[PDB]
Amino acid sequence: GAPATVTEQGEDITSKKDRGVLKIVKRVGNGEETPMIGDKVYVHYKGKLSNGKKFDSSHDRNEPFVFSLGKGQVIKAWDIGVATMKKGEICHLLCKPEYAYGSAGSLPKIPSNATLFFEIELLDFKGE
Ligand SMILES: CCC(C)(C)C(=O)C(=O)N1CCCC[C@H]1C(=O)O[C@H](CCc1ccc(OC)c(OC)c1)c1cccc(OCC(=O)O)c1
């Protein structure tokens, strides 16, 4: 399924090149600009465990998710992944546990040692 496709085709966007965060650009966005540290970013996302089990979707709430980029306000794979995106881009991210919730998990929805899959659409971003 989609998580295995990221394993097979994803771009390694980690500084260490350890395959910890792999990315497929599903829809190329527009403009040259990517969001910068401290920007307010707006996304829609769907999250599942790598085995396909859904844990959350902002579409179900009709509620974009908003955060400040590059400040450790979200899991490492999101700060790394969203910084590579263009406005209007849709990507798939596969995140090894060390770039997600690691040993602690996010219990009960996310177990310890979980690889996570996210679909992310970068709706907008604005300087603080
Ligand atoms: C349980 C799964 C939830 C949390 C619902 C989920 O879908 C999810 O996994 N996320 C929500 C959308 C952004 C990615 C991801 C997320 O980062 O949520 C983070 C989880 C907490 C976290 C922050 C920083 C971290 O490292 C610097 C960190 O590492 C373990 C954990 C989160 C941020 C803000 C709000 C939030 O939940 C809603 C709330 O508390 O109101 C969850």
CSV table of N, CA and C and ligand atoms in Angstrom, one decimal, residues 45 47 55-56 65 72-76 78-79 100-101 105-106 109-110 116 118, ligand 1:
chain,number,residue,atom,x,y,z
A,45,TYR,N,-3.8,16.9,7.0
A,45,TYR,CA,-3.1,15.7,7.1
A,45,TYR,C,-3.9,14.5,7.4
A,47,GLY,N,-3.0,10.7,9.2
A,47,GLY,CA,-1.9,9.8,9.8
A,47,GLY,C,-2.4,8.4,10.0
A,55,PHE,N,-5.0,6.7,12.6
A,55,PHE,CA,-5.0,7.3,14.0
A,55,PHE,C,-5.6,8.8,14.0
A,56,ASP,N,-5.5,9.5,12.9
A,56,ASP,CA,-6.1,10.9,12.9
A,56,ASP,C,-6.2,11.5,11.5
A,65,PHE,N,-4.6,22.0,10.5
A,65,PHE,CA,-3.7,22.0,11.6
A,65,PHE,C,-2.7,23.1,11.4
A,72,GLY,N,10.4,22.6,17.1
A,72,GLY,CA,10.2,21.4,17.9
A,72,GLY,C,8.8,21.4,18.6
A,73,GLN,N,7.8,21.9,17.9
A,73,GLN,CA,6.4,21.9,18.3
A,73,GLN,C,5.7,20.7,17.8
A,74,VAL,N,6.3,19.9,17.0
A,74,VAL,CA,5.7,18.8,16.3
A,74,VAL,C,6.8,17.7,16.2
A,75,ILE,N,6.5,16.5,15.9
A,75,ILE,CA,7.6,15.4,15.8
A,75,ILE,C,8.7,15.8,14.8
A,76,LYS,N,9.9,15.3,15.0
A,76,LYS,CA,11.0,15.7,14.2
A,76,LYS,C,10.7,15.5,12.7
A,78,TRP,N,8.1,15.9,11.0
A,78,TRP,CA,7.3,17.0,10.5
A,78,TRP,C,8.1,18.3,10.3
A,79,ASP,N,8.9,18.6,11.3
A,79,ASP,CA,9.8,19.8,11.1
A,79,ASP,C,10.7,19.6,9.9
A,100,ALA,N,9.8,10.1,15.1
A,100,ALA,CA,8.4,10.2,15.5
A,100,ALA,C,8.3,10.1,17.0
A,101,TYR,N,7.6,9.1,17.6
A,101,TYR,CA,7.4,8.9,19.0
A,101,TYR,C,8.2,7.9,19.8
A,105,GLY,N,6.1,6.3,22.6
A,105,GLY,CA,4.9,6.2,21.9
A,105,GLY,C,4.1,7.5,22.1
A,106,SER,N,2.8,7.4,21.7
A,106,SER,CA,1.8,8.5,22.0
A,106,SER,C,0.6,7.7,22.3
A,109,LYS,N,-2.9,5.6,21.1
A,109,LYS,CA,-3.2,5.5,19.6
A,109,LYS,C,-1.9,5.1,18.9
A,110,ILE,N,-0.7,5.6,19.5
A,110,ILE,CA,0.6,5.3,18.8
A,110,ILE,C,1.4,4.4,19.7
A,116,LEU,N,5.5,5.6,11.3
A,116,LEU,CA,4.2,6.3,10.9
A,116,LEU,C,4.2,6.8,9.5
A,118,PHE,N,2.3,9.6,7.0
A,118,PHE,CA,1.4,10.8,6.9
A,118,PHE,C,1.3,11.2,5.5
B,1,LIG,C1,-2.0,10.8,18.7
B,1,LIG,C2,-1.7,11.2,17.2
B,1,LIG,C3,-1.9,12.7,17.0
B,1,LIG,C4,-1.1,13.5,18.1
B,1,LIG,C5,-3.5,13.0,17.0
B,1,LIG,C6,-1.4,13.0,15.6
B,1,LIG,O1,-2.1,12.9,14.6
B,1,LIG,C7,0.0,13.4,15.4
B,1,LIG,O2,0.8,12.4,15.5
B,1,LIG,N1,0.4,14.6,15.1
B,1,LIG,C8,-0.5,15.8,15.0
B,1,LIG,C9,-0.2,16.6,13.7
B,1,LIG,C10,1.3,17.0,13.6
B,1,LIG,C11,2.1,15.7,13.7
B,1,LIG,C12,1.9,14.9,15.0
B,1,LIG,C13,2.5,15.7,16.1
B,1,LIG,O3,3.6,16.1,16.1
B,1,LIG,O4,1.7,15.9,17.2
B,1,LIG,C14,2.2,16.6,18.4
B,1,LIG,C15,2.5,15.6,19.4
B,1,LIG,C16,3.4,16.2,20.6
B,1,LIG,C17,4.9,16.3,20.2
B,1,LIG,C18,5.5,17.5,20.0
B,1,LIG,C19,6.8,17.7,19.7
B,1,LIG,C20,7.6,16.5,19.6
B,1,LIG,O5,9.0,16.5,19.3
B,1,LIG,C21,9.7,17.8,19.3
B,1,LIG,C22,7.0,15.3,19.8
B,1,LIG,O6,7.9,14.2,19.7
B,1,LIG,C23,7.5,12.9,20.2
B,1,LIG,C24,5.7,15.1,20.1
B,1,LIG,C25,1.1,17.5,18.7
B,1,LIG,C26,1.4,18.9,18.6
B,1,LIG,C27,0.3,19.8,18.9
B,1,LIG,C28,-0.9,19.4,19.2
B,1,LIG,C29,-1.2,18.0,19.4
B,1,LIG,O7,-2.4,17.4,19.7
B,1,LIG,C30,-3.6,18.2,19.9
B,1,LIG,C31,-3.6,18.9,21.2
B,1,LIG,O8,-2.8,18.6,22.1
B,1,LIG,O9,-4.5,19.8,21.3
B,1,LIG,C32,-0.2,17.1,19.1
